[PDB]
Structure formats: structure tokens, C-alpha cells
Amino acid sequence: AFRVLKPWWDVFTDYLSVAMLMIGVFGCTLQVMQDKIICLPKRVQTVEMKGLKTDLDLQQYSFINQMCYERALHWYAKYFPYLVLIHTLVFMLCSNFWFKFPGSSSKIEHFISILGKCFDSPWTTRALSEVSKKEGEQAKALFEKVKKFRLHVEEGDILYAMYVRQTVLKVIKFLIIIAYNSALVSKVQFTVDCNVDIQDMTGYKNFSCNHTMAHLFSKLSFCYLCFVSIYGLTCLYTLYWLFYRSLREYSFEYVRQETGIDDIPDVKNDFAFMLHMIDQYDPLYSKRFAVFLSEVSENKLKQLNLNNE
Amino acid sequence: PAYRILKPWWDVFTDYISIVMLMIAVFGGTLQVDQDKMICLPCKWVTKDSCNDSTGPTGIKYDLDRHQYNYVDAVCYENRLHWFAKYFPYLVLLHTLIFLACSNFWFKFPRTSSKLEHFVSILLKCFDSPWTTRALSEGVLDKKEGEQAKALFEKVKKFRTHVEEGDIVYRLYMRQTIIKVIKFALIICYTVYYVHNIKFDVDCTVDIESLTGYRTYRCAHPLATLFKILASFYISLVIFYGLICMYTLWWMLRRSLKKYSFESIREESSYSDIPDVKNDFAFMLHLIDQYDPLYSKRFAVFLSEVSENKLRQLNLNNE
Amino acid sequence: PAYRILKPWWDVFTDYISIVMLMIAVFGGTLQVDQDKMICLPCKWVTKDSCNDSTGPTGIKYDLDRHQYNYVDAVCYENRLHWFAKYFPYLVLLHTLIFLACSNFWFKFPRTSSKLEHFVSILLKCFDSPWTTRALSEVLDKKEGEQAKALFEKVKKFRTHVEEGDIVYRLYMRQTIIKVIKFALIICYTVYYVHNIKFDVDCTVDIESLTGYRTYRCAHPLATLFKILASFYISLVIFYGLICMYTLWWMLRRSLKKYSFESIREESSYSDIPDVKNDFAFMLHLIDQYDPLYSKRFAVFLSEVSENKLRQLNLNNE
Amino acid sequence: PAYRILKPWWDVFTDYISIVMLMIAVFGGTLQVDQDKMICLPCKWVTKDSCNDSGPTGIKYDLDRHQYNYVDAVCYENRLHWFAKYFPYLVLLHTLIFLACSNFWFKFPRTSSKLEHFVSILLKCFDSPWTTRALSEKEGEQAKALFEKVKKFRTHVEEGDIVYRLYMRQTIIKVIKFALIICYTVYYVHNIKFDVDCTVDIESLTGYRTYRCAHPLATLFKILASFYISLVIFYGLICMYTLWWMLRRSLKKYSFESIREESSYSDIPDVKNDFAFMLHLIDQYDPLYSKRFAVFLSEVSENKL
Amino acid sequence: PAYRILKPWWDVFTDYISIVMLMIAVFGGTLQVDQDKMICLPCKWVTKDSCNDSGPTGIKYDLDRHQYNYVDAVCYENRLHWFAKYFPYLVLLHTLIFLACSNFWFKFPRTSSKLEHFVSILLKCFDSPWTTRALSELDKKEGEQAKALFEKVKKFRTHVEEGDIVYRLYMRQTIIKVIKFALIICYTVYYVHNIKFDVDCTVDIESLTGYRTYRCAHPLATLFKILASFYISLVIFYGLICMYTLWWMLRRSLKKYSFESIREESSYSDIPDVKNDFAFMLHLIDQYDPLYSKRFAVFLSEVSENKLRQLNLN
Amino acid sequence: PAYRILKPWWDVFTDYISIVMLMIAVFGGTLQVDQDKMICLPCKWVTKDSCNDSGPTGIKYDLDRHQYNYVDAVCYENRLHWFAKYFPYLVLLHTLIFLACSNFWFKFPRTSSKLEHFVSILLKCFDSPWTTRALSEVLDKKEGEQAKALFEKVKKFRTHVEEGDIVYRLYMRQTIIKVIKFALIICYTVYYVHNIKFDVDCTVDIESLTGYRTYRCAHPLATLFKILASFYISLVIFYGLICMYTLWWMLRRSLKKYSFESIREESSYSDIPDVKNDFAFMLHLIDQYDPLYSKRFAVFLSEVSENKLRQLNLNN
């Protein structure tokens, strides 16, 4: 399970995307059956009031309705739910870009495996208590696994960079969505004026229409806009965390203060980035792995293993 | 499933109440989607924007087409019928989503989800362990259960150091309860204030005389009495939910949940060396006590150095 | 699932009756939502606000638009149709949900749920244990003897933990009492108000300013259908009530808080099984209502003579 | 589920008929909900309270759309035969009672527990390999324990015959219900007609006394009714055969004469009551299982063990 | 499922064809329930009770909406071919009959028990380590399981060879499917052409409407014709597959199974000649995969028994 | 599922695309079934049966509602183009054929048995402890016997599948069919996608029944049937592109011979011979999903590893 590598912002955006998809589905269902426009001709033909007679059949009325729905209504009011569905599907597909890559997922599985193994390894806690047999053999095997992981992952540079690409893509898509939604959210209005030229068919050329689902679509548009705004603040803070502190280098000086060992080499590049990930998840894992990263700790472990042998 | 041990009677009650409220929201949503209309009839005799209300009887001829009637319905439905009667099911659905997110936030928030999952795993694995049964009973034993019990004993010791340092779970649960109770207060204020605006007969003066020919129309909202019944049922459910949340807050505030004492456990059992644990560990132990004291009773032996002395001696005899 | 052992015939019958009542609740709900209209025609012969009910025949001209007709329908459906004919399916759905909640509050309340889960686990492990088979006969391996000793101690600890409490029996008491009271109220108000579901009704709502007629004759089309549904519902509730009544008698003809093991102690060789009380006794009574063999072979794990015999057999094996 | 062994060809195949009766009940109920109406037109020429039936131009009735709807509702309620209106609900009711009567055998806790124990130990005895050496004429401890379980189950089950009497009662209920269903359906199937003549006396509200209505979902209902009858007929035949089978021989007395004559173990006694009937059902489903289980019922097989 | 090994390519192809036919049957049924009607307009000008059909202004028929509904219902009941009305129920019934005929193999208790117990033996023989050792050419537990499975194999051979109920059941099912395909094809091909868009109805309701002859447009006519053509194509495929299955049964005696090829290729040359119902099941498992039969047949040689008993003692 | 190891990235991408076009099919079918009508108004003034198109008062056509419904039905069935009416059904049919072509490898029993056996032995090798031990390059005797057994299964399965090439031929055939079908869909759809129009003039000659000759209809679900079709086209193109890549992957390398040169060089056992035909193609697909499975299965295919296991079992 890679949910351990998933931070809180990723799962927050996941539930936000699920809510966005639900909003889009609801809007599409509204558009399928409840979406209709009602058009009445303009300039027809204690007091008493008499109704204005338009002399129009039901079929002329339906023709006016759909002739003004196709033309007079703004395209945003007609295709808002479909745009929401498309954008939320792109968001969901892009949300796990950094998760779905084959080599990246292999690196993530390897990293979570070694970190869980050293967390389950008694020698981590034993050495942490000491500074501040069979299990020694397993500790030495885990330490050479640490060295293998250092030689296999740290030299690469794909993880932080491609995470930055994913965050930048999310921020850009958020900005475009907010811009176009704020520009076209005033188009969704209840009463519209339709000026189609069907005078040869219905006798009238100017109609006043109302879009019956304009209020609900306006509320849905504002709800989706606020959801996208929250998504954008999440991605902006993610960008701030990515760029403010260099995740190309992880300083283990806090372990140097806690653990008496000082010959701890600072991790670099993707090792630093993934340790930043797990520190956001649980810093205890990082400070417990740092004593398994020091080569002086390896020399001490070799000395104790030789003494036991 | 495995998390049911962290849900006391109040959490189960709120979950089921939220299910019923979500059902109400869904039912109202389909009702509005299908048959929420507003049958509007013009007032023939008007007196300053008000209907005058002045040999067999003959029906009143309004000279309005079906489409003019539909236009009047749409305009008066948008303009004059109160916003509560239009967005009641959506407001209920939004409130239920907020309530369900608040109740299940700490299950999905990973910093607390890790602690909760690890606590669930070690608690069940300690509950079904046979060393607990042998220790509570108070020779020779199997090897495999030997290192299983030793691994359980050291993993409990490491999990105590991993959780006792912080109080994130207690803080998150307190914040969730506070948000739920203030949400209940806001809902039970505004809903009861605007619940009387769901009326059957509504008069609309929308000024569409240039298109229809009339000015004032006396509309009837069909799904108004049923919506008022649904809103009353929703208010009753929210009142129950708020009472349960206030009980949860009182339970959290009366006793310090960041301090769990095994004084009863260490007196009944032989092991009087079990320490009084604190912070988040004390909090989830209190939650487990609210579910079932037997889980805490069985797990507490894994906190005593006397039990691990006996286990180490028996393992040394075994090897 | 695994709790079927705790459900006697009355619980299964009430569960199935709740299912069919929920089915008719859903069916009435769809009928109410979709096709519950009220065709109302004005009475052109008004005699002090009453329908007088008085050469080819010619149709009566009412001079009413379709929307005035719909307004008349809506107003005389809201005002003059009885609330029972409009909210019968919702009331039936609510009552079915209350019955289901009363049934499942046993397994949903965390303390009693934990007690029942522990009882199911202990009883099942005793049921599949090999040793009781030999105890029913009157050898075991070292592993079998060890797990039999562990199960014996687990049964002792369960008896210490459960027999002290009395929450389960009180909860079943309260659920049965609430179900009986709900059945009585349902039958009373239903059988009182079923006769108000009629086809032809006369409505007089004073919309003469908007329609031109004072009184109308309305025809609720679903009413007869709803009537038979109401009758069907009553029958189901009646059966439910009778079943619940039996439960009450079964829960008052004897003190279920005291189980006597005289039958097993006189059938098997072991005549030292202590009489069990409180929640343990009640759950064993329910198990007896499901299958007597479960408690029959559970009794051998409560006797100290059987425990001593198992210890002696283990010593003989080793 | 685990009761497939206790389901002979009559049980499974009538269950399939029971599940196909339910489909036409749901299909009919959907039809009755959606478009079960009657289009009623007034008879302008009326003689002796009936329709006289005495370019071209249309006939003006001077009736509103709502007057037409009221006429439809009143004539559908008063002058449409109740079989046509409530056929799908009656089919659903009969099918639900058939399902309840065929599954209350497995839902009643007494018979449920007895059948469950029989099935469980029959399966675990079928998994036992020592029956192969038996019929040829740690593993030993397992065979002895299963022998003890079989004997102690037999001493518990052979005392009473609750399962057999309940199965008899269920089958008799099924056959008498089939008889009632086929009788009343044959009686009332002809009342489903497309064209009907309604006379409701609403001349005060409409202006016409007699109307001639057309019922759209009549012929469909008619053929559905015929289909239902066919299914019911088939069902009854199977139930009839079941009666004959359960009255062909003493189902409460299972004789192991063939098995004990074929095998060396001739000490097998005659089984009685529920165990006998259940072994008869096993023989019906598969004679292999009864023959393979019979060797552990014999004590000289334990003498071999 | 467990009977997947007993379903050859023809059976699974017929299963998917039946699923598709059921899908289009449900589609047509919902269509006929919801959107099926006919819009009928009276013929104003008549010639001997027919349709003379002799700025423009619309023709005033002077009919109410309910008179039009009555005309539609009466013409739909009287003058519209029964195929165009009950085609979805016909395809649904035929698909259900085909599906029941195909799945009656696994529901009849005698044959169902035979196939299930055969499937169990074949699976545990495929997973039998002694099968592996016999193919190559021993633990005591594996030897005990091997002896038990050998005894199960021979007792199954005795139990199933006495009567060929499975072969007769499968042959009758195939014959019924072929006959049903033939009948469906002739009657459907004969009756497709009666699904027309325009239909003239002379239903004699002049006393209630005022017109005698009407012209109706059937909206779900071209859609029903397209569905009927699709159903005809699917039944063509089903019938060709069933005819191949019948030819496969009839060309060679499936009641005899010569093990000459396997006993010649494999080391064991003493493999018995499987006959009758067991031969039919082995032909079915050959049609699935010859490897299953090759890895099950090592348990039929009496030579392997002698090797198994000797290795059990050793 | 358990067959995901044989499904490369292009296969799962095609599965996702086909799921989306199934969603298109169900949406268009629901729309067509429920709300697909055609409102037609008569042209009051016509010049040579063509609409002249010459306060204001409404035009009275003197037509009943039922005459309007008759006109709508006749001009929907006789003058609206067949593509606009049957686009969702064609989409559903093509999606079903694409899914059938994808799963004809999956359901056809002759190749299905080989796939089951290959997946079963791969999963056994993945979970075999001695496989991990040999990859790391003292054992349980039963584990060693089972390892020698799985070696024998590897050899007999090699003899089973190397003799035939139906699996590779089947996969190539479905790839070719998918490419040809995608070409046909793209061609006919780009031809007929312009026939979906909003305003359609109809001339049906029902003047004897309605009084009018020519009418002008406006098909409601036209533009929404337009863009969907266009967007549908887009998905098909991607499908075709993916399929074409697969076709390229058919001819870039000979899948009937898959060499082990990289595996034996990195491993200690530099003795393994190459595989051929269906084994070679299936190992290529395994490499497409994950080369680790193939490299791990390589230790159960060599003869030096067989000798090493024989010597170890002699010691064990």
C-alpha cells in the first residue's frame, strides 16, 4: 500500500476530486431530464385584467423553446456539468501521476519496504537506546540493504522533479479553471432574451425566455468554484513546501542533536525528497532510519557482531 | 470493520442518524428533481397589487395558454418561493456530508490513521494471543508462540514510545466534536428559524404583465406540506445528533482522557507494576473501555515488567 | 451471518415480516411519488355547498383551463384528502425502520455486541473442539490437550466476565416491550384510520375567486389500491404482534436469568456442572431455542470434574 | 449453498419455475404501475342503458381533458374486473408464498440445525478415505472420532421426524395452493378484455351515462395470464408427482438392504424417521453418498477399525 | 466457475451469444413498454371504405385528444401484426429457453453430481504430486493421498461407465437447441416483413370517433426491424455453432475413447480404453485442454499402482 | 486480476478507452430512448415547395396536437439521417466488438488453458522460497522436492507450448482486426459526422393527412449528439494510435524468439538457452509488464540451476 507515501494534501485533493465528480454527475442528471427553457413572445399582438393571447400552438411553443435553447442560451449554461466532468476526470488522472510511474513505483515500494523493515528491526531501537546473535546478522543484512538502496536511488533525480511537474500542472489547471469559471459564471442567468428569426414560422421574432435550472446551475457553479479554490490553495501550499525548502538535501542535524552519533552523511536528491515525504507522514521513521544511515554506526555494529561471533 | 472497536455507542448512533439524514436528503433531492413545481393562477380582480377576492356557477376564463402558465410558474417559483423550500434537500445533504467528514476525518487523516491502525492491529493480536490467557490464568510452551509473544511484547513497548509522546488523536477528536456541536447549533438555529417559510399558498407579484397580461398570481406549492414534514423530521434528527454530541463533549470534558490509570487492573491482577499511561494512548484506551473493558484488561498485562520477566525466563527454559 | 445461532424462530419470522413490510413501504412510496393524483371535477349543481348529483347527451362545459384544473387538484389534495391516504407508505416505512432498529439494537450497541461476539466465539470454539466429543463419548494429542486446556480456561474467564453482567437480558426485555407497544399503537391508529382511504371524496376549499366553483368531486385513483395495501399491512403487523406476544410470554413464563443444567448432568456422567445465571444463562437459553446440542456439548466445559479428567488424560498422554 | 445435496430434481426445477413466476409478476407489476389505464369514450347513442352503436367529420363530445381523465379513473375503478387490475399482485403474492413454503424448510431453526448437522457430517465423512477400504470389502484416530460423531448424531436425529412431517406439510400446501390457483385463474382469465363497456352514472359531472372503454394492457396481461397458468400447471404436475413419490413407499423407513448385501458389512440396521427421510433424499440426489456413508453406520466396520 | 473445464469453445460462444440476445431482448422490452405506440390520423377522404387521400391550411379532423388516444389504442390492438408487438417477448422467451437448455446440464441432480465429482477428481489429479512423479517416470502423506486418489479414480470409472446419462443429456440438449434454432429462423424470417412504419387500420369505430379508416405511423418500427435483423444474425451464428456441435457428436462415437495415442506417447503402455459416459467426459476435457486428460490418465494404469504400493512401503 | 501480468500498458489503456466509449454508448442510448424527438413546424408560405421566409401576430397552422405528433414521427423517420438516429447504437456495437476482440484471447479455451497454466506457474515461482534463494545467489526436504517438481513442470510446459504458436497468432489477429476496425470507424464517422444537424427541412408528402407538403424540423439532441460524436472520434483515434503502436510492436522485434542474453549476463547462471514461439511471446509480454518476473522465472529454466538444486538436495 502506497497510502503511507500519500501525504494529507494528496488525500484531501482525492476527496475533493470525488466531490467534484459527484457534483458533475448531479449536474449531468439535471441537464438530462430537468433542463428546460420557457420562452414567451415579446410584444404580443379594482380593474379587470385579461390575458394576452399569442395565438400559438403547443408545437410552435416547443419550437420556440428549443430554437432559443440552441442559440440564445450561453454555451456555459448548457455544458457546465460536462466541463466539470471532464476537468475532474483530468484531475483524478493527474492526481496519481507520481504514483503510477513504473520506475517511480518500484522505487517507492523499495523505500517503504526498507523503512518498514528497519522500523520492525529491533537493532534500530537497541542502538538508539544504547547511544542515547541472529538479530545482529539481520541488522547487518539490513545495513547492506541500506547501502544498496543508497547506491540505487540517491543518484537519480526523477522523483522530486516529476512531483514538481505534477504540482505545477495542478496549479496551472486550477488557475485556468478559476479564470474561465469566473469569466463565464455571469452568463448563467435566469431570464434571457432570444432574438432568433423564426418570424416566417411563429409570427414573432423576439422572445423572452427563462432557464428554469439557471439558479441551481449557478449554485452548482459556485460550489464547484469554491471546491476548485480549496484545491488550488492546497496545491499552492504544496508548491510553497516544494520550493521553500530544498528537498534535494535532507539535513539529519536533528538526529545529530538527539543521537550522540555525528558522522551521519546528509542524504541527497530523491533520498532527501522521500525522507521529506515520510517526515510529513511520520518523522519518527526518519530519525530512526538516520542511525541506520551512518557508516560509523555500521562500524560499531561490525565491532559488536565480531565480539558476539 | 476493524475500526468498530474505536466507535462507542455515541459514534454508532451518530453514524446511523447521519445515514437516516442522508436518506432524507436523497429523497428530497429526487422529489425536487421529479415533481417540484408551482401551480400558479392569476388574480382576475386586483386592488393595488392584491387580489380583490370579489344561475349555475361558471368557470373563470383567464385567456392564458399552457405555455404562459408554465412561464408564470417558472417566474414565480424563481422569484417568490422561499429559498429554504428550494434548497432544503441540498442543504440537508451538505450538512450530512460535513457531519460524515467530521466523524470520519481522523480515520482518513494519515497522521492519526497510522496510530489508529497500529493500535487496532496490536490490540486484536494481543486479544487473541494465548500468553494473555495464560497470564490472566495466574510450565512449558510452544516455540512459535514463544517468539510471537516476544515480538508482541517488544512491539507494544515500541508503540508506547511512538504514541505517548504526542496527543494528536485526542486533539483531533476534540476538534471534531467541537465542530460537530457548533454545526448542530447553527443548523438547529437557522432551520427552525426558516422552517415556517415552507407554505402551500404563496402570492407572487412578479410584474410580467407585458408577456402574460396579469401582475399578481396565487400559486400553490404542492411539495410544501411533505417538505415541512421532512424538515420537521430532519430537525428532530439534528436535535438527537446534537444531544449525542453534547454528551460526547461532556464525556471528554468531565474526565481527563489523557491519563488512564490501571489501578483497578493492577489490583485485581497479580501484576501491580503496570504503569499509568497517558496522552493519546490513554485516550484510545478510554475509547476501548467505552467499547469493551476486556480488550484493555487483556492488553494491560503486556505493559508489566513482571510478565515480560516471566516470558523471558520461560523462553530461556524453552531454548 | 455468524449470529444466526442467536436468532430463534420468532426473530427470523419478524425479520422476514419486516422485510415484506419494507417491500410494501417502498412500493407505496413509488406509487405515491409517481401516480398519486386527484382528478377533481367541479359540481355545477351546488345546493348549500353540496353536490346535487342531478335529445342526444351533451358534455358539460366547465370553462376551466388545464391549469385551473391542476390548481383544483393540488388544493383539494392538500386540504380535503385525509393525511392517512397521503402518508400511509411513509408511515409504514418509518414503522418498519423502527422495528428493524429495535431488532438490531441488540447487535449494534457496543457493550452487548461485544458480549455476544465473545459468546459466539467461545461457543463455536467449544462446538468444534475435539475434547467435548470424547466428553460426549464418556484419546487426545499433546496439541489437542493444550488447546483444550486453553479453551477450558477461556470458558472460565468468559464465565467470570459475562455472568456478572445483566445488560443483554435487559436490552432484549426493552426491545421486546418497545416492539409490543409499537405494534399496539400501529394497529390502533391504522385500523382506526383505514376507512378514511376512499375513492370518491367531496372537496370544498373556497377557491371561487380563482376557479369559479365552490365545491368539487374528487376521485383519488390509488386509494383503493392503498386500501388493500393497508389491509395487507395490518395483517403483517398482526402476525408481527402475535409473534412478539409469544416472545413476551416466552420471556415471562420463566426466569431466563437462571439456567439449570440438571438434564445434562443426569444424562452425561459429569454431575457437577454449576447452574449458570444472568446474561450467560439468557444467551444459553437462546442457543437452546436454536439448537440444544450446542449448549449440550458446551456444558462439559463448565464442569470441574471434566477439567480434572482432561488434566489426568493429558498427564497420561505425557 | 450447502443444501444443494438436499435438493432433488423436483426441488430445484420448481424453484426455477418459482423464479420465473416472479419475473412475470415484477414485469406485470411494472406494467400495472406505469401504463395500466383505460381510454374511455362516451357513447352518444345509448339504448337500454347500453351503447346503441347507431367526407366524414369527427364527433364532438364537448368534454374537457380533465373530464376524460375523471371518466377514465371512475370506469377503471368501477367497471374493470378486479382480476385484470390485480393479476400481477396476485401472481407476486402466490410466488412469495411458494418461495416461503419452499424455503421455510431451511429457515425454521429446528430443521435448519438438523439439516446443517447432517450435511456437515455427511460432507466430512465423504472426505474421509477409509470408506474406500470399507466398501472394497493419525488417520485411524480421525476415522474413530468421525465414527463417534456419526453415532452420536444418529442417536439424536432418529428420535424424531420433524423434518419429514414439515416436508410433507410443505408439499401438501404447495399442491393445494396450485389447485386453488389454477381453478380461480381458469375461472377469471376470460374477464381480461381489451374493450369493455363502463356504466358508472356520472351524468351530473360529465353529461354521459355510458362509455365504451379500451384497456391497453389487456391482451398482454391475457397472454401473461396464460403463461402463468402454464407455469402453474407444470408446477402442479411436479408437486403431484412429489405427493406420489412421498406416498410411494415409507420414506420414514430407509432400508440399507442393497448396500449391506453388496458390501461385506451386512450388520447395517434399518434407519428410521428424519435420518431415514434425509438418506432417501440423498439417494434421490446421488446413491453414491448413501452407499459411501453406510459403512460408518455399521459396527463391524468399527470392528475392522 | 467449476464447470469451466467442461465448457468448450462452442458452449462459451453460445453463452455469449445468448447473453447478447438477452441484452437486446431487454432493450426491446423496455422500448416497447415505454416508447411503443402508433400515431394514427384519420383519412378524411374515403373510397369504398379505404383511404382516397385526395398558402396551405391544415386539415381540421375535429377530434379531441382522447378520441385520438382511443383511435391509437384500438388500431394498435386490432391492426398491427403480432410480431411487431411481441417481438421483444419472443426473443426474451427464446433466449431463456436456449439458456435453460444449455444450463440444464449442471442443474439436473444426477448429471450435476457426476460433473461436479468429476471436476473435483480432475482438479486434484492436476494438483496431485504423484501425477508429477508418474509423468517423470515419495513422502508417506503424499503416498497416502495418491493411493486414495487412485482408489477414487477406479471407483469413479466403475460408477460412471455403467450408464451414459450425461452423454444422452448433452445430445438431447444439442438436438433441442438445433430444432429451436430452425423453428426460430423460419418463423422470424417469415414474419420480419410485417414490421412496417405505415399501417392502415379499418377498425370501425365510426360511432365513437366519426371516421372508419385511419393511417398510423409506428415509431418503433425501423428500430424493431433493425433489432429483428440483429437477432436473426445472432440466431444464425448460434445455429451454425450448434450444427457444428451436433456434427462433432455424430461423426465419431464419443462413447468410445481410444487411449492409444497417450499410451503410446507416454511411458505407460497399459492405459485402459475408457468407454461410455467417462469417454464422453474425457472428450469434453480434451476439447478444453489435452494436458488435463494427459495428467489425469496416469492414475488409470495398474502398473503405476504397483509402483505406488512399492514406493509406499519403501 | 490474476491476468494483469499479461496485460501491458497499451492493453490497459485500450481497456480504459473502451470503458469510456461504453459510457458514451449508455449515455447516448439513454438520451435517444428518452428525449430524442423532432419538433417540425409547417412552412406556411412555400415557393416551389421551398420555405419562402418572407404588433406581430402568431401564425395559425390549424393543426391538432396529434397531427403535429404524426408530422414529427414521419419527418423523424423519413428525412432525418440515419447517422443522427443510430449513432449511440453504432457506438455501443463498435465498443462491444472492441471488447470482444480484446477478450477473445481471454475466453477462447485453447489459448485460455495455456494462459492459466503459465500464470499459475509464474505465481508459484513468484512465491517459491527456493526461487528467492536462487535469486540471492540449506533447505527443507519437502521444499526441495517441490522445487525439483516445479523444474519438471517448467520443462514439460516448455515442451507443451513451444510446439505451437496459436497464442501469438491469436494476439496478432486481434490486433490486426482492431486496427482495421478503427480505420473503418474513423472513415465512416468523419464522413457522416456532418449529417448531424439541428435544422432539417423535410418533404414527406402527407398533405392528404395534415394539409402541408414541406416542413422544417429542429432536432433537439443534435449539437449534443454532434460534440459527443466528435469527442467519441477523439477516443477512437487514441485507441487506433495505441493499436498501431501494438502493430509496430508486432514487427519491431520477432516475438517468436525472445533471447535471454541480458538475463544470463547479469546472473551467475550464464548457460540458459533461448525460448521460442508462444513461450517467447508470453515472456515478452511479461517483460512488458515487469522484467523482474521473467528474470526470476529464468532460474527455474536453466540446467546449471537444475544441477545446483540436485547437489543441494543431495546435501539437503
Side-chain angles (χ1 to χ4, degrees), chain C residues 6 22 46 111 140 168 236 293:
Chain C
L6 296 135
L22 200 56
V46 156
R111 190 146 51 105
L140 260 74
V168 157
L236 293 170
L293 153 75

PDB file of all heavy atoms in Angstrom, chain C residues 6 22 46 111 140 168 236 293:
ATOM      1  N   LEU C   6     -28.081 -17.032  17.434  1.00  0.00           N
ATOM      2  CA  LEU C   6     -28.781 -16.265  18.455  1.00  0.00           C
ATOM      3  C   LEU C   6     -30.188 -15.861  18.043  1.00  0.00           C
ATOM      4  O   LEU C   6     -30.895 -15.241  18.845  1.00  0.00           O
ATOM      5  CB  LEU C   6     -27.987 -15.008  18.815  1.00  0.00           C
ATOM      6  CG  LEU C   6     -26.622 -15.205  19.467  1.00  0.00           C
ATOM      7  CD1 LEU C   6     -25.616 -14.285  18.809  1.00  0.00           C
ATOM      8  CD2 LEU C   6     -26.697 -14.949  20.961  1.00  0.00           C
ATOM      9  N   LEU C  22     -41.205  -3.632   4.575  1.00  0.00           N
ATOM     10  CA  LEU C  22     -40.348  -2.678   3.880  1.00  0.00           C
ATOM     11  C   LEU C  22     -40.600  -2.706   2.377  1.00  0.00           C
ATOM     12  O   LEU C  22     -40.544  -1.667   1.709  1.00  0.00           O
ATOM     13  CB  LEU C  22     -38.883  -2.980   4.184  1.00  0.00           C
ATOM     14  CG  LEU C  22     -37.889  -1.846   3.949  1.00  0.00           C
ATOM     15  CD1 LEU C  22     -38.299  -0.625   4.741  1.00  0.00           C
ATOM     16  CD2 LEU C  22     -36.490  -2.289   4.333  1.00  0.00           C
ATOM     17  N   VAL C  46     -74.800  23.205  -7.116  1.00  0.00           N
ATOM     18  CA  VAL C  46     -74.479  23.379  -5.705  1.00  0.00           C
ATOM     19  C   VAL C  46     -75.770  23.675  -4.953  1.00  0.00           C
ATOM     20  O   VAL C  46     -76.505  24.607  -5.302  1.00  0.00           O
ATOM     21  CB  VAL C  46     -73.446  24.499  -5.505  1.00  0.00           C
ATOM     22  CG1 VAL C  46     -73.540  25.087  -4.100  1.00  0.00           C
ATOM     23  CG2 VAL C  46     -72.042  23.979  -5.776  1.00  0.00           C
ATOM     24  N   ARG C 111     -21.506  -2.576  23.915  1.00  0.00           N
ATOM     25  CA  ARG C 111     -21.281  -3.475  25.045  1.00  0.00           C
ATOM     26  C   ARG C 111     -21.928  -4.834  24.801  1.00  0.00           C
ATOM     27  O   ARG C 111     -21.279  -5.882  24.923  1.00  0.00           O
ATOM     28  CB  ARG C 111     -21.820  -2.836  26.324  1.00  0.00           C
ATOM     29  CG  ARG C 111     -21.430  -3.556  27.602  1.00  0.00           C
ATOM     30  CD  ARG C 111     -21.227  -2.567  28.742  1.00  0.00           C
ATOM     31  NE  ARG C 111     -22.361  -1.664  28.896  1.00  0.00           N
ATOM     32  CZ  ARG C 111     -23.266  -1.756  29.860  1.00  0.00           C
ATOM     33  NH1 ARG C 111     -23.202  -2.702  30.782  1.00  0.00           N
ATOM     34  NH2 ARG C 111     -24.261  -0.874  29.903  1.00  0.00           N
ATOM     35  N   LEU C 140      -6.541 -37.852  23.118  1.00  0.00           N
ATOM     36  CA  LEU C 140      -6.170 -36.527  22.643  1.00  0.00           C
ATOM     37  C   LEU C 140      -4.655 -36.401  22.546  1.00  0.00           C
ATOM     38  O   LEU C 140      -3.921 -36.940  23.379  1.00  0.00           O
ATOM     39  CB  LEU C 140      -6.722 -35.440  23.568  1.00  0.00           C
ATOM     40  CG  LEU C 140      -8.002 -34.743  23.105  1.00  0.00           C
ATOM     41  CD1 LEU C 140      -9.207 -35.659  23.266  1.00  0.00           C
ATOM     42  CD2 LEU C 140      -8.206 -33.442  23.865  1.00  0.00           C
ATOM     43  N   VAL C 168     -27.526  -7.612  28.691  1.00  0.00           N
ATOM     44  CA  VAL C 168     -28.063  -8.242  27.485  1.00  0.00           C
ATOM     45  C   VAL C 168     -29.530  -8.611  27.678  1.00  0.00           C
ATOM     46  O   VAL C 168     -30.382  -8.324  26.824  1.00  0.00           O
ATOM     47  CB  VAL C 168     -27.212  -9.467  27.108  1.00  0.00           C
ATOM     48  CG1 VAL C 168     -28.001 -10.437  26.260  1.00  0.00           C
ATOM     49  CG2 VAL C 168     -25.951  -9.030  26.390  1.00  0.00           C
ATOM     50  N   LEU C 236     -49.867  -8.180   8.252  1.00  0.00           N
ATOM     51  CA  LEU C 236     -48.470  -8.401   8.599  1.00  0.00           C
ATOM     52  C   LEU C 236     -48.202  -7.950  10.022  1.00  0.00           C
ATOM     53  O   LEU C 236     -47.694  -8.730  10.840  1.00  0.00           O
ATOM     54  CB  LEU C 236     -47.558  -7.671   7.616  1.00  0.00           C
ATOM     55  CG  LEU C 236     -47.580  -8.195   6.182  1.00  0.00           C
ATOM     56  CD1 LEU C 236     -46.830  -7.258   5.256  1.00  0.00           C
ATOM     57  CD2 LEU C 236     -46.997  -9.592   6.118  1.00  0.00           C
ATOM     58  N   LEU C 293     -28.096 -28.991  21.106  1.00  0.00           N
ATOM     59  CA  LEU C 293     -26.825 -29.712  21.116  1.00  0.00           C
ATOM     60  C   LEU C 293     -25.657 -28.779  21.420  1.00  0.00           C
ATOM     61  O   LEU C 293     -24.665 -29.193  22.034  1.00  0.00           O
ATOM     62  CB  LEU C 293     -26.627 -30.426  19.779  1.00  0.00           C
ATOM     63  CG  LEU C 293     -25.208 -30.706  19.280  1.00  0.00           C
ATOM     64  CD1 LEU C 293     -24.590 -31.865  20.048  1.00  0.00           C
ATOM     65  CD2 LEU C 293     -25.218 -30.993  17.792  1.00  0.00           C
TER      66      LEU C 293
END
